[PDB]
Design an enzyme around this catalytic site. Structure first.
Site, PDB file in Angstrom:
ATOM      1  N   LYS B  50     -46.281   4.801   8.453  1.00 11.12           N
ATOM      2  CA  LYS B  50     -46.025   4.638   7.070  1.00 11.12           C
ATOM      3  C   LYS B  50     -44.662   5.060   6.965  1.00 11.12           C
ATOM      4  O   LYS B  50     -44.246   5.115   5.653  1.00 11.12           O
ATOM      5  CB  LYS B  50     -47.045   5.651   6.538  1.00 11.12           C
ATOM      6  CG  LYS B  50     -48.709   5.470   6.358  1.00 11.12           C
ATOM      7  CD  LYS B  50     -49.631   6.350   5.974  1.00 11.12           C
ATOM      8  CE  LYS B  50     -49.859   7.445   6.917  1.00 11.12           C
ATOM      9  NZ  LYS B  50     -50.682   7.392   8.348  1.00 11.12           N
ATOM     10  N   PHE B  91     -42.075   7.569  20.650  1.00  9.97           N
ATOM     11  CA  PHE B  91     -41.944   8.270  22.037  1.00  9.97           C
ATOM     12  C   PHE B  91     -42.998   8.841  22.084  1.00  9.97           C
ATOM     13  O   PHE B  91     -43.936   8.831  23.251  1.00  9.97           O
ATOM     14  CB  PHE B  91     -40.633   9.200  22.096  1.00  9.97           C
ATOM     15  CG  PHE B  91     -40.523  10.084  23.178  1.00  9.97           C
ATOM     16  CD1 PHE B  91     -40.796   9.684  24.403  1.00  9.97           C
ATOM     17  CD2 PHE B  91     -40.192  11.427  22.964  1.00  9.97           C
ATOM     18  CE1 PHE B  91     -41.084  10.595  25.400  1.00  9.97           C
ATOM     19  CE2 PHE B  91     -40.192  12.478  24.035  1.00  9.97           C
ATOM     20  CZ  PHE B  91     -40.487  12.085  25.166  1.00  9.97           C
ATOM     21  N   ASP B  96     -48.681   9.834  24.362  1.00  9.43           N
ATOM     22  CA  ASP B  96     -49.890  10.520  23.985  1.00  9.43           C
ATOM     23  C   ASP B  96     -51.161   9.597  24.365  1.00  9.43           C
ATOM     24  O   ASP B  96     -52.304  10.001  24.646  1.00  9.43           O
ATOM     25  CB  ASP B  96     -49.842  11.190  22.565  1.00  9.43           C
ATOM     26  CG  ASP B  96     -48.968  12.480  22.400  1.00  9.43           C
ATOM     27  OD1 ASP B  96     -48.741  12.889  23.590  1.00  9.43           O
ATOM     28  OD2 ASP B  96     -48.969  12.906  21.421  1.00  9.43           O
ATOM     29  N   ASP B 100     -54.352  10.732  26.642  1.00  4.74           N
ATOM     30  CA  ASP B 100     -55.817  10.610  26.127  1.00  4.74           C
ATOM     31  C   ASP B 100     -56.462   9.589  26.185  1.00  4.74           C
ATOM     32  O   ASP B 100     -57.963   9.559  25.832  1.00  4.74           O
ATOM     33  CB  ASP B 100     -55.890  11.576  24.824  1.00  4.74           C
ATOM     34  CG  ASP B 100     -54.746  10.908  23.792  1.00  4.74           C
ATOM     35  OD1 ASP B 100     -54.659   9.768  23.659  1.00  4.74           O
ATOM     36  OD2 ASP B 100     -54.140  11.699  23.200  1.00  4.74           O
ATOM     37  N   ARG B 105     -54.215   2.096  18.129  1.00 10.39           N
ATOM     38  CA  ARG B 105     -53.310   2.859  17.524  1.00 10.39           C
ATOM     39  C   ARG B 105     -52.771   1.996  16.430  1.00 10.39           C
ATOM     40  O   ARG B 105     -52.236   0.916  16.638  1.00 10.39           O
ATOM     41  CB  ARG B 105     -52.145   3.353  18.339  1.00 10.39           C
ATOM     42  CG  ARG B 105     -50.791   3.596  17.861  1.00 10.39           C
ATOM     43  CD  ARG B 105     -50.701   4.964  17.165  1.00 10.39           C
ATOM     44  NE  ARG B 105     -51.039   6.124  18.027  1.00 10.39           N
ATOM     45  CZ  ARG B 105     -51.090   7.460  17.897  1.00 10.39           C
ATOM     46  NH1 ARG B 105     -50.864   7.727  16.484  1.00 10.39           N
ATOM     47  NH2 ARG B 105     -51.155   8.146  18.624  1.00 10.39           N
ATOM     48  N   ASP B 167     -52.292  22.040  23.530  1.00  7.86           N
ATOM     49  CA  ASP B 167     -53.218  21.240  23.238  1.00  7.86           C
ATOM     50  C   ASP B 167     -53.915  20.795  24.447  1.00  7.86           C
ATOM     51  O   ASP B 167     -55.252  20.864  24.446  1.00  7.86           O
ATOM     52  CB  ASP B 167     -53.012  20.344  22.412  1.00  7.86           C
ATOM     53  CG  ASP B 167     -54.122  19.343  21.527  1.00  7.86           C
ATOM     54  OD1 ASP B 167     -55.105  20.236  21.434  1.00  7.86           O
ATOM     55  OD2 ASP B 167     -53.832  18.277  21.112  1.00  7.86           O
ATOM     56  N   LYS B 193     -46.915  21.541  17.993  1.00  9.19           N
ATOM     57  CA  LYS B 193     -47.192  19.941  18.204  1.00  9.19           C
ATOM     58  C   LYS B 193     -46.959  18.725  17.114  1.00  9.19           C
ATOM     59  O   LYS B 193     -46.743  17.816  17.363  1.00  9.19           O
ATOM     60  CB  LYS B 193     -48.714  19.715  18.763  1.00  9.19           C
ATOM     61  CG  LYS B 193     -49.009  18.418  19.375  1.00  9.19           C
ATOM     62  CD  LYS B 193     -50.570  18.023  19.390  1.00  9.19           C
ATOM     63  CE  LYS B 193     -50.786  16.621  20.074  1.00  9.19           C
ATOM     64  NZ  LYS B 193     -52.207  16.428  20.092  1.00  9.19           N
ATOM     65  N   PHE B 232     -51.380  20.395   5.899  1.00  6.25           N
ATOM     66  CA  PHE B 232     -51.580  18.899   6.207  1.00  6.25           C
ATOM     67  C   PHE B 232     -52.286  18.563   7.420  1.00  6.25           C
ATOM     68  O   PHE B 232     -53.223  17.739   7.183  1.00  6.25           O
ATOM     69  CB  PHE B 232     -50.076  18.178   6.559  1.00  6.25           C
ATOM     70  CG  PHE B 232     -50.143  16.882   6.957  1.00  6.25           C
ATOM     71  CD1 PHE B 232     -50.233  15.641   6.486  1.00  6.25           C
ATOM     72  CD2 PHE B 232     -50.140  16.663   8.607  1.00  6.25           C
ATOM     73  CE1 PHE B 232     -50.537  14.385   6.875  1.00  6.25           C
ATOM     74  CE2 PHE B 232     -50.279  15.282   9.167  1.00  6.25           C
ATOM     75  CZ  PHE B 232     -50.254  14.244   8.034  1.00  6.25           C
ATOM     76  N   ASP B 236     -55.820  17.051   7.414  1.00  4.37           N
ATOM     77  CA  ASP B 236     -56.194  15.921   8.223  1.00  4.37           C
ATOM     78  C   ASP B 236     -57.610  16.066   9.084  1.00  4.37           C
ATOM     79  O   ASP B 236     -58.444  15.145   9.150  1.00  4.37           O
ATOM     80  CB  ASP B 236     -55.211  15.920   9.186  1.00  4.37           C
ATOM     81  CG  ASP B 236     -55.230  14.704   9.993  1.00  4.37           C
ATOM     82  OD1 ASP B 236     -54.993  13.444   9.549  1.00  4.37           O
ATOM     83  OD2 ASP B 236     -55.312  14.737  11.198  1.00  4.37           O
ATOM     84  N   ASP B 237     -58.036  17.423   9.586  1.00  4.16           N
ATOM     85  CA  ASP B 237     -59.055  17.435  10.247  1.00  4.16           C
ATOM     86  C   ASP B 237     -60.193  17.255   9.186  1.00  4.16           C
ATOM     87  O   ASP B 237     -61.216  16.620   9.680  1.00  4.16           O
ATOM     88  CB  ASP B 237     -59.190  18.957  10.611  1.00  4.16           C
ATOM     89  CG  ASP B 237     -58.089  19.124  11.608  1.00  4.16           C
ATOM     90  OD1 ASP B 237     -57.354  18.064  12.204  1.00  4.16           O
ATOM     91  OD2 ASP B 237     -57.996  20.183  12.041  1.00  4.16           O
TER      92      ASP B 237
HETATM   93  O1  3N2 Z   1     -47.056  10.606   7.635  1.00  3.54           O
HETATM   94  C1  3N2 Z   1     -47.626  11.697   8.321  1.00  3.54           C
HETATM   95  O2  3N2 Z   1     -48.353  11.278   9.453  1.00  3.54           O
HETATM   96  C2  3N2 Z   1     -47.193  13.266   8.066  1.00  3.54           C
HETATM   97  C3  3N2 Z   1     -46.046  13.387   7.292  1.00  3.54           C
HETATM   98  C4  3N2 Z   1     -44.726  13.972   7.477  1.00  3.54           C
HETATM   99  S1  3N2 Z   1     -43.617  14.060   6.346  1.00  3.54           S
HETATM  100  C5  3N2 Z   1     -44.798  13.051   5.243  1.00  3.54           C
HETATM  101  C6  3N2 Z   1     -44.353  12.889   3.979  1.00  3.54           C
HETATM  102  C7  3N2 Z   1     -45.497  12.375   3.091  1.00  3.54           C
HETATM  103  C8  3N2 Z   1     -46.666  11.958   3.798  1.00  3.54           C
HETATM  104 CL1  3N2 Z   1     -48.038  11.286   2.762  1.00  3.54          CL
HETATM  105  C9  3N2 Z   1     -46.932  12.452   5.130  1.00  3.54           C
HETATM  106  C10 3N2 Z   1     -46.002  13.039   5.720  1.00  3.54           C
END
Ligand code: 3N2
Ligand code: 3N2
Lengths: 343, 343
Positions: B50, B91, B96, B100, B105, B167, B193, B232, B236-237
Site C-alpha cells: 500500500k 528487507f 521474516d 516463520d 504475502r 517476538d 518491531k 495501529f 490490527d490484532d
Molecule cells: O501500512 C501499514 O501497514 C502501517 C502504516 C504505517 S504509516 C501508515 C500510514 C497510513 C496507513 Cl493506512 C497505515 C500506515
C-alpha cells in the site's frame, strides 16, 4: 610476528565490546531478554577465528599513525573498529552457512544448526551487522572520519553481497554446469565476495583513522590489496585439495561441493574432449572414489605445477605493485600482510 | 485523500529507482548477472504493498517544507527516501517470511517460496537493505542531513531487529507457552518491531530533510508516533479476528499461528481457571473447529467491547498528545496520519 604481538590485546578487548553492546538494556529493561540473546550470538559467532582481518586493522593503525598520536583512546578505537571487521565477518558467516546448508564451522556446529536456533539465525546475522554501526557510533561518533568508516563498511557489505549473488548464480545447489566456471567469472566472484572486505576494508579503515582519506591513496591501496586478495583465494583453492590437513588445519571439500574453485577453472581450460567428460562425471559426487578420481585428473594435468608457476609470477607482481602504489604509505603495511599470506 | 493525490508520482518513481540501482553494472559488466538478479528481487518484493510508510515520507515532506523550497530536486529526494523506507520494509518482509515459514504475502507467493530461490532469499533480503544506503548516497550524498538519514535508517534496523528477537523469544515455533504473553511484553514487541520503523522513521526522515533535526523535536514526534504505532497494532490484532475480509482484504490467522496478539493478552488477564485451560487447549491448532472455539471464548469475555472501549480512550490520548507535542510541527502532519489509521 607483527600480529602475534597484537592478538592478545585484541582478543581481550572483545570482552569490553560485548559489555558495551549488551548494556543498552540497562536503560530499557524491557528488551532485556533480547539483549541476552544478542550476547549469546556474539560470543558464539565472533569468537573462534584467527582474527586476521580484525588484527590487520590494528597492526595497520600502529604503522600509519605517529607513535605519539597512539594514546589510550586511539588504540581503543582501532581495537573497536578491528572488531567491527570481525563482526562483519561473523554476519556473513552465519548467513552463508545457512544458505549452503553447512554442518560445521571453526570446528564447532554452525549457529543455525544449533537446536533451538534454526532459521532464527537469520535475525541473529542481521543483528551482528547492526552492532557494527552501534560500535562505530559509541566510539567514533565524534571523530572526523566517522562518516568515512560508516560508508566503507556499508560499501563492503554491498560488494560482498553482490559477490555472494554471483557465486549463487554460478554454482547453483544442484547444477553441475561446469560451463559457467570460466576465468573472468572466477576473478569477479573473488573480487567482490572476498578481496574487498577481507583485504581492502581492514587497511582502508586504518587509513581513514590515520587521516588518509585521499581518493587516490585509497585507489592505490585497493589496487594492491585486491590483487593480494585474489592470490589468497587461489592459494586457498589449491591448498584445499593438494594441501595438508595437518598444516592447513582443515580437510578440503571444494570438489565434493561443486565449488567454482581455481583448480577446476584451470582444469577446464586445459581439458581434452574425453578429459572434460571425466570431470563432468565426477565433480560433485560425495564418493571419495569419484573425488580422488578428479584429483588424479588434476595432477595428470600438472595443475599443481601450474600453481607453483603462477605463485612465482604472483609474488613478483605484488612486489612490483607495492613498489609502485605503496607510497605515500609505508611499504611495511603491505609487505607484512603479504608475507603472512605467501609461501 | 492527502495520500491518494501523491501515490501516483510515488509508485511511478519506482521505475527510476530501479534504473539508478541497476545501472552500476554499466561500468562493471562483470557483475552484470548479479545486477539482473537484483532487479528481479526489487521488482518482486518492493512492489505490491500500500506504500503507506513510503508515502508518509513524501506527504510529510510537503507539509514540513515551504512550498517554494519544493523544487524538482527536493521532491526527487523525498520520493527516493520514501522508497528507501519501502526497501527497509521489503528487507524485513523477505527475511521474516522465511523465518516463520510463511506461504504467501501480498497475495502472491513468498519470494523464498519461489522455485529456484529458496534460502538464497537471505542474500536477496540483505541486498534490499544495501540499496537503501546506495540510494541515500546517490541522492543525498551532498545534503546537510545525509548522516542524519543514514543513522536514522541504521537505528531503525537495529530497533526492528531487536523487536524481532523479542517476538521470536516470546512465541517460539512449537511452544504454546501462553505464560509469556504478558502485557508489557506485548507493548515492547510492538514498540521495537513495528512502531519505530513504521511510524517514527517516515516522519523523522521527512523532518531531517526539512532541517528539523532537533533532538527535542524528534523526541516529541516520537512520543506521538510510537503511541500511534501501538494503537495501529492493537487494531490490527482485533481486526485480524473480529474483522471482515471484504474490508480488511485478508483473513486472520493469529489464533492458528500462536501469535502474541493483543486479543490473547487481554483474554489471559480476564480468564478464570477453566477458561484459561480452554484457551491453553485450542490456541495454536489449525482446525477451524478449535479456532472458532477460541473466538467464542473471546466474545464471551466481551473483548470486542473492551476493544471498542480502549479505542475511544486511545483516540482521546493521541489527540491530547498531538496538542501537546506537535508544535512547532504542523498538527496536520500527525492528524492526517492518525485519520488514516483510526475508525
Ligand atoms: O501500512 C501499514 O501497514 C502501517 C502504516 C504505517 S504509516 C501508515 C500510514 C497510513 C496507513 Cl493506512 C497505515 C500506515
Ligand atoms: O584470514 C583470512 O581468512 C584471510 C585474511 C584476510 S587479512 C589476512 C591477514 C593475514 C592472513 Cl594469514 C590472512 C588474512
Amino acid at each position: 610476528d607483527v600480529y602475534a604481538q597484537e592478538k592478545q590485546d585484541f582478543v581481550q578487548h572483545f570482552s569490553q565490546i560485548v559489555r558495551v553492546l549488551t548494556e543498552d538494556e540497562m536503560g530499557h529493561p524491557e528488551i532485556g531478554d533480547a539483549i541476552a540473546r544478542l550476547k549469546e550470538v556474539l560470543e558464539y559467532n565472533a569468537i573462534g577465528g584467527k582474527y586476521n582481518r580484525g588484527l590487520t586493522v590494528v597492526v595497520a593503525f600502529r604503522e600509519l599513525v605517529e607513535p605519539r598520536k597512539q594514546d589510550a583512546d586511539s588504540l581503543q578505537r582501532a581495537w573497536t573498529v578491528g572488531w567491527c571487521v570481525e563482526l562483519l565477518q561473523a554476519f556473513f558467516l552465519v548467513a552463508d552457512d545457512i544458505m549452503d546448508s553447512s554442518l560445521t564451522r571453526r570446528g564447532q556446529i554452525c549457529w543455525y544448526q544449533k537446536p533451538g536456533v534454526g532459521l532464527d539465525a537469520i535475525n541473529d546475522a542481521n543483528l551482528l551487522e547492526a552492532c557494527i554501526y552501534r560500535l562505530l557510533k559509541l566510539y567514533c561518533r565524534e571523530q572526523p572520519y566517522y562518516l568515512n568508516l560508516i560508508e566503507l563498511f556499508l560499501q563492503s557489505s554491498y560488494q560482498t553481497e553482490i559477490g555472494q549473488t554471483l557465486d549463487l548464480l554460478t554454482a547453483p545447489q544442484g547444477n553441475v554446469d561446469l560451463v559457467r566456471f570460466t576465468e573472468k567469472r572466477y576473478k569477479s566472484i573473488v573480487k567482490y565476495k572476498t578481496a574487498f572486505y577481507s583485504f581492502y576494508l581492514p587497511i582502508a579503515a586504518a587509513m581513514y583513522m590515520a587521516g588518509i582519506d585521499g581518493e587516490k591513496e585509497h585507489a592505490n591501496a585497493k589496487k594492491i590489496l585486491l590483487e593480494m586478495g585474489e592470490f589468497f583465494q587461489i592459494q586457498d583453492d589449491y591448498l584445499d585439495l593438494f594441501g595438508d590437513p595437518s598444516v592447513t588445519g582443515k580437510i578440503g571439500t571444494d570438489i565434493q561441493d561443486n565449488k567454482c574453485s581455481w583448480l577446476v577453472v584451470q582444469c577446464l581450460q586445459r581439458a581434452t574432449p574425453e578429459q572434460y567428460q571425466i570431470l563432468k562425471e565426477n565433480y560433485g559426487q560425495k564418493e571419495a572414489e569419484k573425488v580422488a578420481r578428479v584429483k588424479a585428473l588434476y595432477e595428470e594435468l600438472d595443475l599443481p605445477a601450474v600453481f607453483l608457476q603462477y605463485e612465482e609470477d604472483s609474488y613478483s607482481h605484488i612486489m612490483a605493485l607495492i613498489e609502485q602504489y605503496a607510497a605515500p604509505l609505508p611499504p611495511a603495511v603491505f609487505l607484512g600482510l603479504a608475507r603472512k599470506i605467501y609461501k
